[PDB]
């Protein structure tokens, strides 16, 4: 049995990974209960390569609503929460699957106090994103390019701007007229990308994070039947406004390392016969 | 036997970095107005190596408090806030300088409402952390190891635990009795470490983030002159309790790909 001997340079390489989502900004709520040197491997080969591909991103917001105890006139919380989405699109080469996960940070928190009766209407917190705040849309894919995002030297994304608009939400009061929250738009402009790896005991779970800056644009948002009026932003009541997905489309270039299929180490005479 | 690559090899290398802090969970407040393919570089030569060294993490929390206009009985927030620390220590006959940043996530917020009269005490949000929360501590150093953390394969850390207890905050009411918040303590055990890089335009900016998991302990914490029930956790009023620094000790092993 001939034995093919191993060559001088080591065959070290990438480490097992599972692509997934990143961390999130979260916060619960508690309501009251009453009302009133060593070397581990030898040398190895690696080359720097460029991967420039188109990226299509589809995202969707999500919202959570929590009403307090009592007669039911007043709400405790109306806020944002992460949302996920998946789809298939077509690079000029092939069809590719995609997942995404939206989230926010630096959010502003507004409140309104109609009165101190059981009947009166109060909302203790409704959120709104604005200039200072940001939006992070994480991403992972099945194509070949995403298999070599580990060990990245540089990464830059050219992306288009998008506009998100506010829908409308109706406060179902037991008795009397129904006030309503309506409108509010913010526009996303791209900012830098962020990569991240969490070293748990046996898998390097990893993720990207496309940051996105915000600017404020008309229409305004308003709460009807109240004194709060004509303020800018995107309330959390109905951000999607009846659309299944908002989209961003553009290019991304990465410069990374790659295991070198150097082509020299080969069993001599590896060829067709002659 | 097998063929061998013999030509002169090229020089790819690490990319410029600046070590710093990561992102942070933040949220402002608005108060009412009234009151009522191509190869870029050629084949190169790399190697895999161990860097295993000790570590002393020193940190300290920080709180924010804000009142609401009016008679002065209504607070609107007693919350947490990231904090920084700069220190020096010795490790195997070497003085290392270091910077550390402490933030907290997963907060559980509370509330009290003594009534609606202008005079009644009210605190709309005082936040604690109680087994559903994590404290994330970020650390950077001046040693050689941290220079080669770029392109890491596996990092692990065996670190000792540290108990953090609360102090006391004596709320100031214009007239009458002063109530006070007192108590609480948690134990910070270790969990997975995180490494995160930000490819901004100028230069990459990276961040390490040790992540710790809390577990509640005694003593219990309480708010005087009310009905709040001897709850458990660490109140954000005076978290460091007159101590300049909390500290943790340990060892960390990383396995990194360094240029040869």
């Amino acid at each position, epitope marked *: 049995n001939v034995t093919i001997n191993p060559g001088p340079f080591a065959q070290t390489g990438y480490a097992p990974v599972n692509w997934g989502p990143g961390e999130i900004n979260d916060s619960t709520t508690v309501e009251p209960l009453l009302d009133g040197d060593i070397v581990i491997s030898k040398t190895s080969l690696w080359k720097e390569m*460029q991967y*420039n591909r*188109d990226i299509t991103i589809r995202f969707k917001f999500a919202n959570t609503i929590i009403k307090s105890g009592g007669l039911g006139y007043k709400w405790s919380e109306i806020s944002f929460k992460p949302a996920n989405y998946q789809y298939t699109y077509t690079r*000029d080469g092939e069809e590719v699957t995609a997942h995404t996960t939206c989230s926010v940070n630096g959010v502003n928190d507004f409140s309104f106090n109609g009165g101190s009766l059981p009947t009166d209407f109060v909302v203790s917190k409704f959120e709104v994103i604005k200039e200072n705040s940001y939006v992070y849309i994480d991403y992972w894919d099945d194509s070949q390019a995403f298999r070599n995002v580990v060990y990245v030297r*540089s990464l*830059a994304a*050219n*992306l*288009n*701007s998008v506009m998100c608009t506010g829908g409308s939400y109706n406060f179902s009061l037991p008795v009397g007229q129904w006030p309503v929250l309506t409108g509010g738009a913010v526009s996303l402009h791209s900012a830098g990308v962020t990569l991240s790896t969490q070293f748990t005991d046996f898998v390097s779970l990893n993720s990207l994070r496309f940051r996105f800056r915000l600017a404020v644009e008309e229409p305004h948002f308003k709460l009807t039947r109240t004194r709060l009026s004509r303020l800018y932003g995107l309330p959390a009541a109905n951000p999607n406004n009846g659309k299944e997905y908002y*989209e961003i*489309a*553009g*290019r991304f*270039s990465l*410069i990374s390392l790659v295991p070198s299929n150097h082509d020299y180490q080969t069993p001599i005479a590896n060829s067709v016969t002659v | 036997n097998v063929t061998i690559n013999p030509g002169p090899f090229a020089q790819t290398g690490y990319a410029p970095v600046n070590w710093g802090p990561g992102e942070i969970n933040d949220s402002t407040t608005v108060e009412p107005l009234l009151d009522g393919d*191509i190869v*870029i570089s050629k084949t190169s030569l790399w190697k895999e190596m161990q860097y295993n060294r000790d570590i002393t993490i020193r940190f300290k929390f920080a709180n924010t408090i804000i009142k609401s206009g009016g008679l002065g009985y209504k607070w609107s927030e007693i919350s947490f806030k990231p904090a920084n620390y700069q220190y020096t220590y010795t490790r195997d006959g070497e003085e290392v300088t270091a910077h550390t940043t402490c933030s907290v996530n997963g907060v559980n917020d509370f509330s009290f409402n003594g009534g609606s009269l202008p005079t009644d005490f009210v605190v709309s949000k005082f936040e604690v952390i109680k087994e559903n929360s994590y404290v994330y501590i970020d650390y950077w150093d001046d040693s050689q190891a941290f220079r080669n953390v770029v392109y890491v394969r596996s990092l692990a850390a065996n670190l000792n635990s540290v108990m953090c207890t609360g102090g006391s905050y004596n709320f100031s009411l214009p007239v009458g009795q002063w109530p006070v918040l007192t108590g609480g303590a948690v134990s910070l055990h270790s969990a997975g470490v995180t490494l995160s890089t930000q490819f901004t*335009d*100028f230069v990459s900016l990276n961040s390490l983030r040790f992540r710790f998991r809390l577990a509640v302990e005694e003593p219990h914490f309480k708010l005087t002159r009310t009905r709040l029930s001897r709850l458990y956790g660490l109140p954000a009023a005076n978290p460091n309790n007159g101590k300049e620094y909390y500290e943790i000790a340990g060892r960390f092993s990383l396995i990194s790909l360094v240029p040869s």
Partner: antibody, heavy 116, light 106 residues
Framework: QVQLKESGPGLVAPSQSLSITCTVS????????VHWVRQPPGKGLEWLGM???????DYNSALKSRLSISKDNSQSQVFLKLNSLQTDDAAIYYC???????????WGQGTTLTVS | DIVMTQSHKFMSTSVGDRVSITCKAS??????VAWYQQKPGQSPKLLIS???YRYTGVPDRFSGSGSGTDFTFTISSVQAEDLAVYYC?????????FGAGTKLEL
């Protein structure tokens, strides 16, 4: 403010090379990217190539294998080279900046080329 | 690749008269269109960046609209400065591609 200026021969012979130098000003090449376009007499405009903020480059498929775009960040000047040109390659050439995906924001004066 | 067309190539428009122009695309471009203006002896300029967006400093009379495939560009009053060629760009795909170039006449 920002200014983009070109510089080139103007007259050339077939079966030869070609070199053009866009000299930027008022904006770093480490904060933006640059595009090359041209307009053969009459007809319309095309895209030729693009050089990114980091160093990577992208080309047009039809002219691929003939174009070569590169720059020197400290020299604040991009340079393109085209070889083995023909009579059809005659056109006015314009270097331009990019803001979003492929939006062109500021343009140069534009040099005209004659081949014969 | 992406492919675009313009309805006319030269259009007789009187001064102080409303004018509109259309350019069509082959595939589906949701809202990514731009409009450039080239005067004689001048380098092109960017006036539209989206389906109906207005770049800073562009005059008010100019505006745009359209969604899906069909897209249009409209002026309310022609003026002497407005005699020039106008191109429509697409930017929802890898090769940016312009139209043929349709212009005006007085």
């Amino acid at each position: 403010q920002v200014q983009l200026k070109e510089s080139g021969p103007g007259l050339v012979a077939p079966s030869q090379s070609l070199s053009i130098t866009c000299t930027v000003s008022g904006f770093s090449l480490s904060r933006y990217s640059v595009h090359w376009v041209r307009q053969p007499p009459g007809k319309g405009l095309e895209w030729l190539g693009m050089i990114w903020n980091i160093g990577s480059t992208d080309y047009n498929s039809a002219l691929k294998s003939r174009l070569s775009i590169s720059k020197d960040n400290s020299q604040s000047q991009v340079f393109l080279k085209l070889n083995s040109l023909q009579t059809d390659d005659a056109a006015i050439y314009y270097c331009a900046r990019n803001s979003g995906f492929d939006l062109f924001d500021f343009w140069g004066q534009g040099t005209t080329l004659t081949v014969s | 690749d992406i492919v675009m067309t313009q309805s006319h190539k030269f259009m007789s428009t009187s001064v102080g008269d409303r004018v509109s122009i259309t350019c069509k695309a082959s595939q589906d471009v949701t809202s990514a269109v731009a409009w450039y203006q080239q005067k004689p002896g001048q380098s092109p300029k960017l006036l539209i960046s989206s389906a109906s967006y207005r770049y800073t400093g562009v005059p008010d009379r100019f505006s745009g609209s359209g969604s899906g495939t069909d897209f249009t560009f409209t002026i309310s009053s022609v003026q002497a400065e407005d005699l020039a060629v106008y191109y429509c760009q697409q930017h929802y795909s890898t090769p940016p591609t312009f139209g043929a170039g349709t212009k005006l006449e007085l």
